Design a protein around this ligand. Sequence first.
Ligand SMILES: *C/C=C(C)/C=C/C=C(C)/C=C/C1=C(C)CCCC1(C)C
Lengths: 221, 66
Amino acid sequence: MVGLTTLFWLGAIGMLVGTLAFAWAGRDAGSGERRYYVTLVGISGIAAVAYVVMALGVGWVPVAERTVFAPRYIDWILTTPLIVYFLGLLAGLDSREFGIVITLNTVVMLAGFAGAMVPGIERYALFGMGAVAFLGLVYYLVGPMTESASQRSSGIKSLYVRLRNLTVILWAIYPFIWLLGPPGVALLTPTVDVALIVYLDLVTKVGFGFIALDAAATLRA
Amino acid sequence: IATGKMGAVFIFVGALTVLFGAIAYGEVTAAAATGDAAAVQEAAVSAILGLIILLGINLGLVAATL
Ligand SMILES: *C/C=C(C)/C=C/C=C(C)/C=C/C1=C(C)CCCC1(C)C
């Protein structure tokens, strides 16, 4: 009475509802305002695609005693750079340090995927790398990008601190799911792990975009 | 417009907390049906860790939204 099928299906339909909402909110386009909405729809659409392909049965990989949901790692590697792109859009980021942002993000994500695919205690060193790299990204989110967003309008600064807060808080939970779950000390049953990551993805993407929509509407009604 | 605290975020975290509680209690009953106590024990520690993680998620959400 849980169904690992049904958690993936619920995540998929939630991401699709978010996709539809973010796309319909992009009807009245703008100068650059359109690209925020296309970023939101791309994020939630790739998320929905990954969740639908996982809901069938693909990607359930046997890596020594455990199951590796590789399609959700594909999802992460493809959709987290879109989120940091949105945050750079808000804060008014450069281009090279923007590349530093996205490269560090991809370092974390690649380390996580590889570590999920390694069967020995070797993988933890891999995980360690991501941790290190993560602590870089966080700083860039709270230091350089925040200082960049400081030289901006009131509403955009408020929206940036809201989104960067949610990101910095909830992204730091994924490593504990990786460690306390199948990829490490399998203390969380696959159902609990899957449900936790589904909820995390659902909020950190769709609720992220909902907050962004609301902020934009309020600031320039 | 919702409640001062947005009559959506608290009701939302509450409904999804009780949904996760249903998930965990279902796992607990399923593992107990086997009669093996070491199966429930596992399901219970995983439910406890997951509810602590859910505490973290809900608190992050309420800290960012307010
Ligand atoms: C919608 C997808 C999201 C929000 C993905 C976020 C993922 C992370 C923040 C993952 C972090 C990890 C590390 C810090 C180290 C390696 C293990 C990971 C991939 C779980």
